[PDB]
């Protein structure tokens, strides 16, 4: 459950360590973003010499939320952080690796390359 | 607030119209089947001390 001002761990090797959501790209006025949704974020913290650097305004898809997400089979799944993967306008990773598990919901929403690159899909 | 106040004195008619609901309802009473005295139902009779056939209480 991500909203503007929410911080996200970035789960890739783009160089960004932390991003702060400034908009959830899902209609006229979405209040929250969840797994599989795209947000616009400010890069609040990075490591030297990445693709991305502190101050950049980037797009990312959320892959892990601390608020548990519910599934049609009656189950739910929740993570220890809120994480995201930085993308281009084509919904593709800007980096070449993704770290930590990701939500299976990503697959349904055409983030196949990220699902693949993930070490685990839960 | 800014201290509301009656704008006009209430007429004898209007004050008495207000009170058209103020009449007391008389106490509802039933005979005690033992001493035939009048008392409220579902109460131990305060004159003989009987309720539900038996002596319960010292009057």
């Amino acid at each position: 459950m991500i909203q503007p001002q929410t911080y996200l761990e970035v789960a890739d090797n783009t160089g960004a360590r932390k991003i702060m959501c400034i908009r959830v790209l899902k209609g006229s006025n979405a209040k929250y973003a969840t797994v599989g949704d795209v947000i616009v974020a400010s890069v609040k913290e990075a490591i030297p010499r990445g693709a991305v650097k502190e101050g950049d305004v980037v797009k990312a898809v959320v892959v892990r939320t601390k608020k548990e997400i519910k599934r049609p089979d009656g189950s739910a799944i929740r993570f220890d952080d809120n994480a995201a993967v930085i993308i281009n306008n084509q919904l593709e990773p800007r980096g070449t690796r993704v770290f930590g598990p990701v939500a299976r919901e990503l697959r349904e929403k055409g983030f196949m390359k990220i699902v693949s690159l993930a070490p685990e899909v839960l | 607030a800014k201290h509301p106040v009656p704008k006009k004195k209430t007429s004898k008619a209007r004050r008495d119209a207000r009170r058209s609901h103020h009449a007391l309802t008389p106490p509802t009473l039933v005979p005690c089947p033992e001493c035939k005295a009048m008392k409220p139902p579902h109460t131990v009779c305060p004159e003989c001390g009987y309720y539900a056939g038996r002596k319960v209480l010292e009057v």
Binding site: - | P40, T43, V44, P46, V56
Partner: protein, 118 residues
């Protein structure tokens, strides 16, 4: 709202209301009959019924349970040795409540008696 909530509040905070029932329990087990306001009375029934029921168990654990509310060793001895036996065959309902016909002068409160059954 109050939807399906059990238990009167009796305009006392949590610990006062507790003390209220305990003290009424002591008085009831002591004198066999007390007079109170109707609401306190209906509310006393269950609280005391449970205490009697444990005295029908008779065992150590139950005595130590009752002592938490009643606090008085002698009164509990009376509970176990004299009171509880009267109810060996009785299946609950060891207390009755009957409303008196006159209200308190100073506040008009309706009164009732709470006594132990025979």
């Amino acid at each position: 709202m109050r939807h399906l909530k059990s238990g009167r509040k009796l305009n006392r905070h949590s610990s006062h209301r507790l003390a209220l029932y305990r003290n009424q329990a002591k008085s009831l087990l002591t004198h066999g009959r007390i007079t109170t306001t109707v609401p306190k009375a209906k509310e006393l029934r269950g609280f005391v019924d449970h205490l009697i029921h444990l005295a029908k168990r008779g065992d150590l654990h139950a005595r130590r349970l009752v002592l938490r509310d009643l606090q008085d060793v002698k009164l509990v001895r009376k509970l176990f040795d004299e009171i509880a036996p009267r109810y060996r065959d009785r299946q609950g309902g060891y207390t009755r409540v009957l409303k008196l016909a006159e209200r308190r002068r100073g506040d008009g409160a309706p009164l009732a008696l709470v006594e132990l059954v025979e």
